[PDB]
Design a protein around this ligand. Structure first.
Ligand SMILES: OC[C@H]1O[C@H](OC[C@H]2O[C@H](O)[C@@H](O)[C@@H](O[C@H]3O[C@H](CO)[C@@H](O)[C@H](O)[C@@H]3O)[C@@H]2O)[C@@H](O)[C@@H](O)[C@@H]1O
Ligand SMILES: OC[C@H]1O[C@H](OC[C@H]2O[C@H](O)[C@@H](O)[C@@H](O[C@H]3O[C@H](CO)[C@@H](O)[C@H](O)[C@@H]3O)[C@@H]2O)[C@@H](O)[C@@H](O)[C@@H]1O
Ligand SMILES: OC[C@H]1O[C@H](OC[C@H]2O[C@H](O)[C@@H](O)[C@@H](O[C@H]3O[C@H](CO)[C@@H](O)[C@H](O)[C@@H]3O)[C@@H]2O)[C@@H](O)[C@@H](O)[C@@H]1O
Ligand SMILES: OC[C@H]1O[C@H](OC[C@H]2O[C@H](O)[C@@H](O)[C@@H](O[C@H]3O[C@H](CO)[C@@H](O)[C@H](O)[C@@H]3O)[C@@H]2O)[C@@H](O)[C@@H](O)[C@@H]1O
Ligand SMILES: [Ca+2]
Ligand SMILES: [Ca+2]
Ligand SMILES: [Ca+2]
Ligand SMILES: [Ca+2]
Ligand SMILES: [Mn+2]
Ligand SMILES: [Mn+2]
Ligand SMILES: [Mn+2]
Ligand SMILES: [Mn+2]
Lengths: 237, 237, 237, 237
């Protein structure tokens, strides 16, 4: 099975599987039932921004999601990723729709990771920044319904030609190169992730959400994980 | 008076004023009596590295000081700098000697600060990296006994021609430009500081230490702040 | 007696002093009479972007000015800055108006400079990025009519309350810290400058232009340098 | 066949195939016979540094190779990479030995690539920095005799237990993710490469050299490319 650590931007409450009775952001550690959540006042049709950060000194994973001229939603959870994830992982974005839909458009995405080992200035680093996505984005592994090129944007889930969002859709984009998330002999290790999105929903309720995730290198979308599973988990356990 | 927030690498225990009975690292918030300290196994004559980090999401200031092939010392303290420091500050390094001495040589120093406001990718940032210090380092404000140029290093305190450290010395180096440490309308704000040092002590005990500090723009060495005061505080209150 | 090296975005042709008969961009080395120019199809009322780059290996100063979905204007000139400028300089933006006007609005400005000396990874660097300008921008030295805060932008020249541009206006913005542009023992040295602007002109012709400049630390606006002198030169020599 | 653009650090002159009669650095565009070379005073047993740069404004590829307290070797060639290389490529380091040998040790390697298309601050970037190489370096594709982990270094060619170099050896290291080297709608595009090496040769003459290269994504070591072919070319044409 895949080892998943994700920060979810959950637009649809599934109170039956542990979701809060309102849209929220949460920290998922190997389960869709977030170890921590915070109320999120999602704004339909508006471009928002998410920022996720973590460092081995504090061993705390935090995220802030906000819209311009609007209060932000913050969520933090104490977790030592050395004990949860493998040394080498892959990072990506995931999204899904179920009975209800919304567009899960990504306008930009950047990530920076640094590892300092026991030596002078000996820091290994990785950084990538996407502001425009091309039709042939070779450095991205697109899974499921995810597609690039539409207006230079990344469409995680299926959107028809007339621009309307489709139900029962799942899609992910993983950066091509494996990321060395930690090392036993590292003094300091940290990562920063930032992405802007546009969740637009024409129907009754928006669903199901977007999630930033870290996984084992060979991770793939679990079969049937549309809807509430965010394309990350095989079941709601 | 000056508003000081510093991370001290205290090599000499002054138990009479609140120091632990062993070398330690500490977080000083407007007073030399650290709000938080951690035992530090200082290694005489060896190059060490210090890393300090802070972000407005967690509102926690942390630091790690280590030597190669050696366990590190970590210290963290929850503090909202918005309520402590002014919006515009100056960052620097400070060091002192008293009856007992040590060299307070800085081999490198880098700093990165970022402020994200309520707007798309609207991030203001400042970054500087010093690996070599020249005889005429115009972007540094040297105070007291601090001098640059000797072997491309920054000597915070007085070191004789023969290379031996002098007692009763104080010196600081502040980066020339004021730093916008925070702003009421910032979504995220963070800073990272890193510096390598070389503390060498020929005499009985090493004293007194090095400190990374953030202060009011016009800060200056208080008179008589050699020894235990680290060139940062006027008294031991 | 300032030593000036600037890249001009000349919106008004003053053929009487050497300007081409059309808007152009040029490389000015101690004189308003560009050593090199290129036709520039300036677009009234549109946000444009300028990029300047230089490296000691090629000893060539290049710039590209473009507007979205439009052809760019490029200008390059072979010049060894070690022979032209002092070791320590200051960098800034300048703008002026005369009988004719235009707004010289700066929306963003970033600069990065690196110096690699004869040592392993021993690089000294400086980087600052401005996407938003505040009312109290302490790390900037505003000269002449330059002001910050207006909609988070940098207005180099005088703009009325209603927004209309004023004639006979000069203004500059220099970054607070001195920049080590070069060093005799440097293997490689390079710098990159990028800024976006908005030149809007209601009157007959736009005038006079914007310029990115490098100067001696203590440089200041020459008396009477409004109009064709761009706030950089004392005369048309 | 592979499309190769490389900067060679040729330690062994093969005059019979066009090599100058002295160690040299060169720019190879699809052939082992450099379009441009420069005399290089290689220092046996000393750590050196190589810096390569390119930008679409000047369309010139330059490189500087130097040793501390020593004069550098510079080589530049005017070439538009849009006409030579495909849009997506892979970057790496290559080295070889033949009848004569040397160690082709890489101590560090960093790369930065940026593409700015027709849009505000819309820049796509990639940056990776390697100061330490681990035994299980997953983000690198090791070809031939290349190995990592030995003292945290990258040994491009075969070296024994006692550290001595082996003859008739070839090896390469390519970064895992494909690099978008160019795009038809990009205003500016640039890349920078830096790496430190240690060429040590116990035998009569050092051979054959190290090279930084850009190639088609699926490139692999040509059959029989040991010796003078630097593991990049199938023949000496
Ligand atoms: O796209 C949203 C949703 O679609 C699919 O589920 C449809 C409905 O399925 C079950 O009926 C319910 O889970 C329902 O959820 C509502 O009712 C629950 C029980 O009353 C309650 O606990 C929930 O909080 C909610 O009010 C679903 O709407 C499927 O794709 C889901 O995975 C997906 O989340
Ligand atoms: O450079 C070290 C120290 O030098 C100067 O003080 C010298 C001594 O001054 C006082 O005697 C004491 O504070 C002493 O400290 C020792 O004794 C204390 C009392 O027994 C004890 O609490 C301390 O922990 C320590 O054992 C000093 O050594 C002066 O410049 C000081 O500022 C400076 O720290
Ligand atoms: O703001 C533009 C301009 O305003 C001020 O000069 C106004 C006029 O001053 C002089 O008459 C001329 O230089 C004139 O320039 C035009 O005519 C010239 C002669 O025919 C010709 O060489 C020029 O190319 C141009 O067509 C100006 O219009 C003063 O502030 C100037 O510095 C400023 O550039
Ligand atoms: O590692 C060096 C070299 O080893 C292998 O070639 C060995 C020799 O092969 C041929 O004899 C020659 O090319 C010789 O080169 C010398 O002599 C040439 C003719 O006089 C002269 O042009 C050359 O400049 C050189 O002095 C080689 O030494 C094989 O692996 C080669 O690929 C490899 O370069
Ligand atoms: Ca849900
Ligand atoms: Ca003390
Ligand atoms: Ca003019
Ligand atoms: Ca050769
Ligand atoms: Mn949830
Ligand atoms: Mn103390
Ligand atoms: Mn002109
Ligand atoms: Mn050659």
């Amino acid at each position: 099975a895949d080892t998943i650590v994700a920060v979810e931007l959950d637009t649809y409450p599934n109170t039956d599987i542990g979701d809060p009775s309102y849209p929220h952001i949460g920290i998922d550690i190997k389960s869709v039932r977030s170890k921590k959540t915070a109320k999120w006042n999602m704004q339909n049709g508006k471009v928002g921004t998410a920022h996720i950060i973590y460092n081995s000194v504090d061993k705390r994973l935090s995220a802030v999601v906000s819209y311009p001229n609007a209060d932000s939603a913050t969520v933090s959870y104490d977790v030592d990723l050395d004990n949860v994830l493998p040394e080498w992982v892959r990072v990506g974005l995931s999204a899904s729709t179920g009975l209800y839909k919304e567009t899960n458009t990504i306008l930009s995405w950047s990530f920076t990771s640094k590892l300092k080992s026991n030596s002078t200035h000996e820091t290994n680093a990785l950084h990538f920044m996407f502001n425009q996505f091309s039709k042939d984005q070779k450095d991205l592994i697109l899974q499921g319904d995810a597609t690039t090129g539409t207006d230079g944007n990344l469409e995680l889930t299926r959107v028809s030609s007339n621009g309307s969002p489709q139900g029962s859709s799942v899609g992910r984009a993983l950066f091509y190169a494996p990321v060395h998330i930690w090392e036993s002999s590292a003094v300091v290790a940290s990562f920063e992730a930032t992405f802007t999105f546009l969740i637009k929903s024409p129907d009754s309720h928006p669903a199901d959400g977007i999630a930033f995730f870290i996984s084992n290198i060979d991770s793939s979308i679990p079969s049937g994980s549309t809807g509430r599973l965010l394309g990350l988990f095989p079941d709601a356990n």
